[PDB]
Tab-separated table of C-alpha atoms and ligand atoms in Angstrom:
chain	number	residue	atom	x	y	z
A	3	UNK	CA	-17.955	-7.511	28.660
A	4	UNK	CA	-15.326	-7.848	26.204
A	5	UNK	CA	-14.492	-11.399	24.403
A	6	UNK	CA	-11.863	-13.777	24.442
A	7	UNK	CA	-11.238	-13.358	20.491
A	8	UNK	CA	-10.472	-9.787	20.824
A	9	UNK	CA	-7.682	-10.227	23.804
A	10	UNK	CA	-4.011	-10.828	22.958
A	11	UNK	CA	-3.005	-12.887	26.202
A	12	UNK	CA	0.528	-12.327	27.414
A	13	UNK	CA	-0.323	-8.492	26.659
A	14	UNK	CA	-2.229	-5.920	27.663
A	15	UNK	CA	-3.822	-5.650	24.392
A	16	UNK	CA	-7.336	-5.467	23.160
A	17	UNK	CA	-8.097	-5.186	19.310
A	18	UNK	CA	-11.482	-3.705	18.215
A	19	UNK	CA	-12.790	-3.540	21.422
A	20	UNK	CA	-14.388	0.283	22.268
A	21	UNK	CA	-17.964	-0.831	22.916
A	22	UNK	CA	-17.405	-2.289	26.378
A	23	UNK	CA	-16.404	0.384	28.846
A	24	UNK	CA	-12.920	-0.033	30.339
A	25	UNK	CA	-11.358	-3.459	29.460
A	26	UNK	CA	-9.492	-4.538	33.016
A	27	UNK	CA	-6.188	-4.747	32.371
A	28	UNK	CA	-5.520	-3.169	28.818
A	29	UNK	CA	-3.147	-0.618	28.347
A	30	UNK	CA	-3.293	0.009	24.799
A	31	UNK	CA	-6.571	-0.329	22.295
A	32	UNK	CA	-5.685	-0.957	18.443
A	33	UNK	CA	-7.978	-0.721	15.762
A	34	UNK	CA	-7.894	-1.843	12.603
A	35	UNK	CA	-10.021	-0.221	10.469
A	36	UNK	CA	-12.545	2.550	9.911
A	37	UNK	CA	-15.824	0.276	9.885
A	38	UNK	CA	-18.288	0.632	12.935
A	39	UNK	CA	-18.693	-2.459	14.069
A	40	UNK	CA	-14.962	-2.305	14.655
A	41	UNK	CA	-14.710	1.286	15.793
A	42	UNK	CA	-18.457	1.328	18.151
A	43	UNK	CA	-17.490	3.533	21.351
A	44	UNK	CA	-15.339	5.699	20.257
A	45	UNK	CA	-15.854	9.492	20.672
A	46	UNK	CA	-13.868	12.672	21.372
A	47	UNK	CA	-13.901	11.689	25.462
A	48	UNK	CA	-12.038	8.372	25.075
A	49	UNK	CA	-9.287	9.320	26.666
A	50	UNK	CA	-6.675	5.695	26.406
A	51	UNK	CA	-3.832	5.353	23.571
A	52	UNK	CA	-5.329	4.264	20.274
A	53	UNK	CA	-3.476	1.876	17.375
A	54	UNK	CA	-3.852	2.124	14.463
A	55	UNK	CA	-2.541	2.991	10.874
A	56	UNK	CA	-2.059	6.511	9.765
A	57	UNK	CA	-5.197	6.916	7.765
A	58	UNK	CA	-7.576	5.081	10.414
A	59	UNK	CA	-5.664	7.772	12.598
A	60	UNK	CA	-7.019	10.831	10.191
A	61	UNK	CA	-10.756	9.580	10.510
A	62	UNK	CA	-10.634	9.159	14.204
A	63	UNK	CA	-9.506	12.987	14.766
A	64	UNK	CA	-11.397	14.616	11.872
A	65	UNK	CA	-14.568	12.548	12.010
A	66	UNK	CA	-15.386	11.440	15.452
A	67	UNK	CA	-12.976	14.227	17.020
A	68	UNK	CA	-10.750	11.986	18.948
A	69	UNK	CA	-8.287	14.311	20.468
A	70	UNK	CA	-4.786	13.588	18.962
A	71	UNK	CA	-2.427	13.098	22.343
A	72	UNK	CA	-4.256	9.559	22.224
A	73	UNK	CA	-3.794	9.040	18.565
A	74	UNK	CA	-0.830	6.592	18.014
A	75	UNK	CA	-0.448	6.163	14.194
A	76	UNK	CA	2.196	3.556	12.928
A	77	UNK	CA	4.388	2.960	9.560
A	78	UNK	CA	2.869	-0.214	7.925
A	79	UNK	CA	6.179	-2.786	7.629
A	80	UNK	CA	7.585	-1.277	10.550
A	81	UNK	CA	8.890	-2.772	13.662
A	82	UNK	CA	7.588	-0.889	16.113
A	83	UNK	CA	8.037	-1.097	20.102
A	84	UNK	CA	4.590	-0.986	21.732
A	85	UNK	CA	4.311	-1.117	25.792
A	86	UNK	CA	7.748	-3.313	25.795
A	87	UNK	CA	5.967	-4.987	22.964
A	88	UNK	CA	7.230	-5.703	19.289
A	89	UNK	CA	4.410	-5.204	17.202
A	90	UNK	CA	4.143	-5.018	13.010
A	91	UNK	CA	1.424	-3.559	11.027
A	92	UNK	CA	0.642	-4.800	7.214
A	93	UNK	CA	-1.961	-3.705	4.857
A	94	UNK	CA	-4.950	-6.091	4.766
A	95	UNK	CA	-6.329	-5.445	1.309
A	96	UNK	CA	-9.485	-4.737	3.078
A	97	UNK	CA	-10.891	-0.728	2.814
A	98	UNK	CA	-8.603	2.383	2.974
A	99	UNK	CA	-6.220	2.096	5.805
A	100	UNK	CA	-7.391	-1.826	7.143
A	101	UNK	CA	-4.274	-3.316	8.750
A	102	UNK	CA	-3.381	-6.610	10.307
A	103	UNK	CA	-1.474	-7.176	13.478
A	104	UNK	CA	1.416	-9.082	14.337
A	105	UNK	CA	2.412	-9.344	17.848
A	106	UNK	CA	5.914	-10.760	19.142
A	107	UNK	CA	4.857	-11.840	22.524
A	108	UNK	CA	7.678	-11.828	25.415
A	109	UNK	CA	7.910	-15.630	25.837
A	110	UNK	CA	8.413	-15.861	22.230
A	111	UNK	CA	4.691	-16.385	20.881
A	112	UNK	CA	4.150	-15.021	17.733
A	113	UNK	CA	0.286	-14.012	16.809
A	114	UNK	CA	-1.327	-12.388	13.642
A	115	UNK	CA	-4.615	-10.678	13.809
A	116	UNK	CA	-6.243	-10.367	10.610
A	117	UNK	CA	-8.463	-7.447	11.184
A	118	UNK	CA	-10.729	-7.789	8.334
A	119	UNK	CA	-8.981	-9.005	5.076
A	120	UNK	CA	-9.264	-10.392	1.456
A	121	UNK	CA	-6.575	-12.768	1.635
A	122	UNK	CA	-3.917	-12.407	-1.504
A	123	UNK	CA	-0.770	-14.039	-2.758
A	124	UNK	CA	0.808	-10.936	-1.951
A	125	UNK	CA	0.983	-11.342	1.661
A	126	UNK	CA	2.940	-14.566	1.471
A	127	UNK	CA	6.261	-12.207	0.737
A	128	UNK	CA	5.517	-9.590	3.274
A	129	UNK	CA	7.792	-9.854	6.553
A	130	UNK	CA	5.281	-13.208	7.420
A	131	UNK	CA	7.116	-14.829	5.583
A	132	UNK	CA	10.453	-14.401	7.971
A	133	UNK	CA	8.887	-16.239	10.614
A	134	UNK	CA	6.313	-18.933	12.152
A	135	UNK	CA	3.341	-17.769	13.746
A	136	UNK	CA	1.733	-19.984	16.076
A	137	UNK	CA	-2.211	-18.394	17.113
A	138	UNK	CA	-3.987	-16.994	14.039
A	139	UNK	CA	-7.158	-14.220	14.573
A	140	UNK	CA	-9.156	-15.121	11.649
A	141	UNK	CA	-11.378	-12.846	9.424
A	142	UNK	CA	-13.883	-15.686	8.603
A	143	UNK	CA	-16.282	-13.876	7.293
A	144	UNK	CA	-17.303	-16.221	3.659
A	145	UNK	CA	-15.291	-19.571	5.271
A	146	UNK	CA	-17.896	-21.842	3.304
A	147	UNK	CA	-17.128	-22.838	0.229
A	148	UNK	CA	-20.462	-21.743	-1.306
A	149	UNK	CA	-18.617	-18.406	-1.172
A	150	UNK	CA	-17.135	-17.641	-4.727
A	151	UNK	CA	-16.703	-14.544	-6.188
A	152	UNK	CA	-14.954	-12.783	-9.141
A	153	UNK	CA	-11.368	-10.471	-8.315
A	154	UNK	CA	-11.849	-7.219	-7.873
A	155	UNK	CA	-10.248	-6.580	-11.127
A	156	UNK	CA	-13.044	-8.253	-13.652
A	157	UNK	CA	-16.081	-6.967	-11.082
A	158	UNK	CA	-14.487	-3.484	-12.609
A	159	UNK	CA	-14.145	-4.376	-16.072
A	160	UNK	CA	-17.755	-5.217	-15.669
A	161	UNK	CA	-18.917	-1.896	-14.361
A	162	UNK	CA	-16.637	0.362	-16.471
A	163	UNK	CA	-17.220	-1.264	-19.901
A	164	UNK	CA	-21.223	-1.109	-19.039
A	165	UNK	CA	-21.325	2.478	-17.660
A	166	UNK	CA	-19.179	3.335	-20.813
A	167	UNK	CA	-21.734	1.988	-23.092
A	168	UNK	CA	-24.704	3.253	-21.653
A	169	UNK	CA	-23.073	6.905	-21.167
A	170	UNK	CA	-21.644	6.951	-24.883
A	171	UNK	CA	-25.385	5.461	-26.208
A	172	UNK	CA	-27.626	8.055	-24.176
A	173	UNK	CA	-25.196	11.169	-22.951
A	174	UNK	CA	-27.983	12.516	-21.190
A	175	UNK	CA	-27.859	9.117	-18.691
A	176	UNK	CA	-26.742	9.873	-15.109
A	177	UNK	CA	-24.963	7.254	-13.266
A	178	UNK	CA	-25.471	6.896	-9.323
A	179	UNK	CA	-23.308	4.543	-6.663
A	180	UNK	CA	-24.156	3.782	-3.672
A	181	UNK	CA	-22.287	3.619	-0.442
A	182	UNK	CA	-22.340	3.584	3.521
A	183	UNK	CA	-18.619	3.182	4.762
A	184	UNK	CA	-15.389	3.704	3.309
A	185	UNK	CA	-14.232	0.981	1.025
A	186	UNK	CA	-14.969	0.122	-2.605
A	187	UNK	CA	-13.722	3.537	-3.870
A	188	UNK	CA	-12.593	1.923	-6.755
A	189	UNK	CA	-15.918	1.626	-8.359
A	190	UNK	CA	-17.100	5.239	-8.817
A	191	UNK	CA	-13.454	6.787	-9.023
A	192	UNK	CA	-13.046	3.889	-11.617
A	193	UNK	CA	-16.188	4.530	-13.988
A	194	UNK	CA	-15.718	8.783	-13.240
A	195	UNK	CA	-12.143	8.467	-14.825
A	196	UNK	CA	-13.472	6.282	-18.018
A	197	UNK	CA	-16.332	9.230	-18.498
A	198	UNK	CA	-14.607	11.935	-17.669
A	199	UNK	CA	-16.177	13.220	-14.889
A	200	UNK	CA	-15.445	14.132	-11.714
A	201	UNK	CA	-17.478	12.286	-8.475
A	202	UNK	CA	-20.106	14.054	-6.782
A	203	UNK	CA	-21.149	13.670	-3.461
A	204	UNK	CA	-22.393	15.103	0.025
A	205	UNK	CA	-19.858	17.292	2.100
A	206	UNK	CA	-20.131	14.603	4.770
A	207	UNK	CA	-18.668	12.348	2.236
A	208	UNK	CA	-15.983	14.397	0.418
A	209	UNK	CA	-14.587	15.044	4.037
A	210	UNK	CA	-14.665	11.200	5.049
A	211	UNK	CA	-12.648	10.966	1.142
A	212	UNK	CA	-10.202	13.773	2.001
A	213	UNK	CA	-8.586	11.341	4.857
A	214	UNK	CA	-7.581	8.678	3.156
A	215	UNK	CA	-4.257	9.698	1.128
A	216	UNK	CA	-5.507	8.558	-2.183
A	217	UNK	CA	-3.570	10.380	-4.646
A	218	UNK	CA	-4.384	12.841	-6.894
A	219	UNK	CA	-7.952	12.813	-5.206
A	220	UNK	CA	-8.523	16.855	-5.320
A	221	UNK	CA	-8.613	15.899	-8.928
A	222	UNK	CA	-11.565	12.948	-9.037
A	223	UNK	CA	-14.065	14.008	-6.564
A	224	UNK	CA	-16.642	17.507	-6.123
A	225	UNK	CA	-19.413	18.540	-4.107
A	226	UNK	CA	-20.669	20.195	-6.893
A	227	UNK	CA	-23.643	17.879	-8.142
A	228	UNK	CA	-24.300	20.093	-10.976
A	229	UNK	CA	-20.511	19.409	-12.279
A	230	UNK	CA	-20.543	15.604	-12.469
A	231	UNK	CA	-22.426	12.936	-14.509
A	232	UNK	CA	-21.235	10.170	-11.557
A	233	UNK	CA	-23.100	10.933	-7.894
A	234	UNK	CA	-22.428	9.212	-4.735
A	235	UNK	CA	-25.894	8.474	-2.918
A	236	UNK	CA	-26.485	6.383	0.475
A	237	UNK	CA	-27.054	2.892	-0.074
A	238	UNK	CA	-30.065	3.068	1.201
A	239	UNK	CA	-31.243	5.493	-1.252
A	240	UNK	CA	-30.688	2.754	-4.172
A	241	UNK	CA	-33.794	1.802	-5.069
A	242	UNK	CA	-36.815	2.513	-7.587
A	243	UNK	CA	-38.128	4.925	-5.385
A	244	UNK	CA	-35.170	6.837	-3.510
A	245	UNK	CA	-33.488	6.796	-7.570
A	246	UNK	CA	-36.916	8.481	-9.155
A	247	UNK	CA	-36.978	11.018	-6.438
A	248	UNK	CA	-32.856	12.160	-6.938
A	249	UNK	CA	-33.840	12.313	-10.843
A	250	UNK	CA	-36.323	15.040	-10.060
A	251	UNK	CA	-33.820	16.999	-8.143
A	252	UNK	CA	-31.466	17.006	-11.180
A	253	UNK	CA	-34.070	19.606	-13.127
A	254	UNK	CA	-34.389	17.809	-16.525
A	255	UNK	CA	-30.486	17.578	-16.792
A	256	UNK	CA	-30.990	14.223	-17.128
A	257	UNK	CA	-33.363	11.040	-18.148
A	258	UNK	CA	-32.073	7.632	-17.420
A	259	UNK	CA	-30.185	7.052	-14.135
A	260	UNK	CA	-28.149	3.618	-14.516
A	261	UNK	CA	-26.910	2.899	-10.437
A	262	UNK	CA	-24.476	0.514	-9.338
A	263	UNK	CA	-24.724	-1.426	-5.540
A	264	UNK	CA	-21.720	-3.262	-4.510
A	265	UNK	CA	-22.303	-5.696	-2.118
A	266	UNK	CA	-20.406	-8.752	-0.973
A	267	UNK	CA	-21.939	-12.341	-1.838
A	268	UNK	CA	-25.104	-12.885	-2.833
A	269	UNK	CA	-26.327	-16.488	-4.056
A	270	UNK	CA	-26.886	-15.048	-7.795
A	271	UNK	CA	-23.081	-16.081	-7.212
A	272	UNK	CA	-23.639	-20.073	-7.178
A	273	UNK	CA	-25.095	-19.586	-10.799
A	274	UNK	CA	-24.273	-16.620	-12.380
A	275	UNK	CA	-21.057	-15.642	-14.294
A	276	UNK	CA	-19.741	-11.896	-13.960
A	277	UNK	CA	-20.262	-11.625	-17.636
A	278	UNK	CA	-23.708	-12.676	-17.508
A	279	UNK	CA	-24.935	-10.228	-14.783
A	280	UNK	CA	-28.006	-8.337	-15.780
A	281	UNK	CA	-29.856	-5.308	-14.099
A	282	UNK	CA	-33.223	-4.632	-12.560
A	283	UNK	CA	-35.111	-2.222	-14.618
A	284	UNK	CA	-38.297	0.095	-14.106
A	285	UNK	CA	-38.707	2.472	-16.514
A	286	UNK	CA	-35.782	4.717	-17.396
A	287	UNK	CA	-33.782	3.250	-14.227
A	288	UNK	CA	-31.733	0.431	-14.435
A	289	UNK	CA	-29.924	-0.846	-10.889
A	290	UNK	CA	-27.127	-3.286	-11.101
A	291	UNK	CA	-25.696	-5.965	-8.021
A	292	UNK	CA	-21.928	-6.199	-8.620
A	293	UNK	CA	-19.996	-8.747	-6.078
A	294	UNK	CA	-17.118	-6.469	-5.524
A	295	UNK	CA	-15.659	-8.038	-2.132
A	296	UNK	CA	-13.530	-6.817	0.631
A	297	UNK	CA	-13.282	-9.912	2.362
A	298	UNK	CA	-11.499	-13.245	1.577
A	299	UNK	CA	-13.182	-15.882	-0.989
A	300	UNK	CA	-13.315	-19.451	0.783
A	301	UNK	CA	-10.369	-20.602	-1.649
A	302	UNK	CA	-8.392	-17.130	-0.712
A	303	UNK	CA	-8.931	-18.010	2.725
A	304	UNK	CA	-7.501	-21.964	2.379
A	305	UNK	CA	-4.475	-20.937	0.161
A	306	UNK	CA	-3.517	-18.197	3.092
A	307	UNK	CA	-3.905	-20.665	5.666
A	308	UNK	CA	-2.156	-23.951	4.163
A	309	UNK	CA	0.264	-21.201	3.411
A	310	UNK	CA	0.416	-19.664	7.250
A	311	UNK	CA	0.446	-23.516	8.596
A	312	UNK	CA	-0.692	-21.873	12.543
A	313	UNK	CA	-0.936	-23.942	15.050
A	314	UNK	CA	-4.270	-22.743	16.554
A	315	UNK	CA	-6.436	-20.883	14.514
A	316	UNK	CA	-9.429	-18.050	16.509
A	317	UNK	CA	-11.923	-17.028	14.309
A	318	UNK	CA	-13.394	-13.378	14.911
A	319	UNK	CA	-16.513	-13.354	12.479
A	320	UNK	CA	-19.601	-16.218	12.465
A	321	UNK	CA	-19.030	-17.155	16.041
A	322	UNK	CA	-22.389	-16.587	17.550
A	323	UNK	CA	-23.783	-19.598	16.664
A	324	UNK	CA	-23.052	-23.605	17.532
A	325	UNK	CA	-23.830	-24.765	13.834
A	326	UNK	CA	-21.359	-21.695	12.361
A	327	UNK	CA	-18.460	-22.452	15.154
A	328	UNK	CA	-18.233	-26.234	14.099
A	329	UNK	CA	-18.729	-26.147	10.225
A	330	UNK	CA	-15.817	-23.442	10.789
A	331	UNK	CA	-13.950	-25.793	12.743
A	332	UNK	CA	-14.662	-28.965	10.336
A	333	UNK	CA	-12.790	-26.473	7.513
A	334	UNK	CA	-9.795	-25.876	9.696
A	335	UNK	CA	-9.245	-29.275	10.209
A	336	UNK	CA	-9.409	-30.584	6.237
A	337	UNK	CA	-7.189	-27.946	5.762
A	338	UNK	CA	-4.438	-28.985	8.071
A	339	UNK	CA	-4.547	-33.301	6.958
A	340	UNK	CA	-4.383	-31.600	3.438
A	341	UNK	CA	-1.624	-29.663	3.690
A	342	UNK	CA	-0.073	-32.127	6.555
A	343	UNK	CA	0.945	-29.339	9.531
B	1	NI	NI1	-14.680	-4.165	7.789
């Protein structure tokens, strides 16, 4: 049975809610993002009008065959009419085509959804800033402050100026990214353009990158492995082992693979500075943890709220457990004698 934190009372809305048969009541699904956890249920037979932003709109028909009468893409920054319903979608500076929701109830309610996010100053001169909101759906995914991490834009810095070196110092080096979702493109398209390369990866892959409008992209990424000195492997496969193994199928092209895994946080965070990270290294492989996030620092998180000032805040990540709900709570509530809403 479906949740209370993915309902929008006063509608008959459910957001991110596939995996539970059909909700009673709900006349129009929205989704977010691309991310399974999010998506989970979905399949060419769903057969109810899908939300959702024009490039979550291209994965659902291309790559789990959703038929496209019950695709319903929206303009981001749009007022759109939904069901008798005003409804806005922004971008959430989360992965390729991650939206938030605002919803102009009837009786005059105003809600935002976050989706998932990575809260920036940016959004506070968006069209939020026109109006109050007064119920909040909260991406509280890192809402402790043991959560610090660099931007985005040193975390590449980092990875470009050390694939750069390595490359320029041993140009028969490969280097190898890992991935399992869409998101984080930056990274290899990033380090491919300082090398000159183009990206190679799986068909399965270059299809998933074909939907997502990034420009010029027929231009950065290849299926043809033997082409490019940047591959796209599954995350899975970045390891000692699973690295060793791809060098062998690369038939003495190369001999060093240097591989980059971007995850979230990880508690070499509390200690370590960006510029100090350093790899793990067997042999002629070297694998580097780079804290590229797509989700909101704790201090992001605080600045968007005293910003939002909401009246009730719902949080839609960390709620499974009593010890995570009231350390969440404890947070909302500093924040609010802080700022004084
Ligand atoms: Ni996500």
């Amino acid at each position: 049975t479906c949740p209370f934190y993915k309902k929008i009372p006063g509608t008959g809305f459910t957001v991110d809610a596939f995996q539970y048969g059909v909700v009673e009541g709900c006349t129009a699904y929205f989704l977010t993002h691309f991310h399974s956890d999010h998506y989970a249920g979905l399949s060419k037979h769903f057969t109810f009008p899908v939300y959702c932003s024009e490039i979550t709109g291209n994965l659902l028909k291309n790559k789990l065959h959703v038929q496209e009468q019950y695709i319903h893409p929206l303009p981001l920054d749009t007022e759109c009419i939904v069901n008798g319903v005003k409804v806005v979608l922004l971008d959430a500076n989360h992965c390729p085509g991650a939206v938030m929701i605002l919803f102009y109830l009837p009786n005059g309610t105003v809600i935002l959804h976050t989706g998932d996010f990575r809260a920036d100053p940016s959004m506070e001169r968006s069209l939020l800033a026109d109006q109050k909101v007064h119920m909040l759906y909260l991406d509280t995914t890192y809402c402790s402050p043991e959560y610090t991490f660099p931007s985005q834009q040193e975390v590449i810095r980092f990875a470009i100026n050390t694939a750069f070196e390595a490359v320029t110092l041993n140009p028969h080096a490969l280097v190898v990214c890992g991935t399992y979702s869409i998101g984080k493109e930056k990274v290899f398209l990033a380090i491919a353009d300082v090398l000159g390369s183009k990206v190679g990866m799986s068909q399965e892959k270059y299809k998933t990158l074909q939907c997502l409008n990034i420009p010029e992209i027929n231009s950065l990424i290849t299926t043809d492995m033997c082409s490019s000195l940047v591959h796209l492997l599954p995350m899975m496969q970045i390891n000692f082992k699973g690295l060793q193994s791809h060098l062998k199928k690369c038939g003495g092209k190369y001999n060093q693979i240097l591989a980059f895994r971007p995850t979230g946080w990880t508690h070499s965070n509390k200690f370590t500075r960006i510029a100090d990270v350093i790899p793990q290294t067997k042999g002629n492989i070297s694998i580097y943890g780079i804290p590229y996030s797509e989700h909101s620092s704790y201090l992001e998180m605080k600045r968007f709220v005293q910003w939002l000032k909401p009246q009730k805040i719902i949080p839609t990540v960390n709620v499974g457990t009593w010890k995570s709900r009231s350390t969440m709570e404890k947070y909302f509530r500093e924040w609010k004698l802080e700022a004084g809403y």
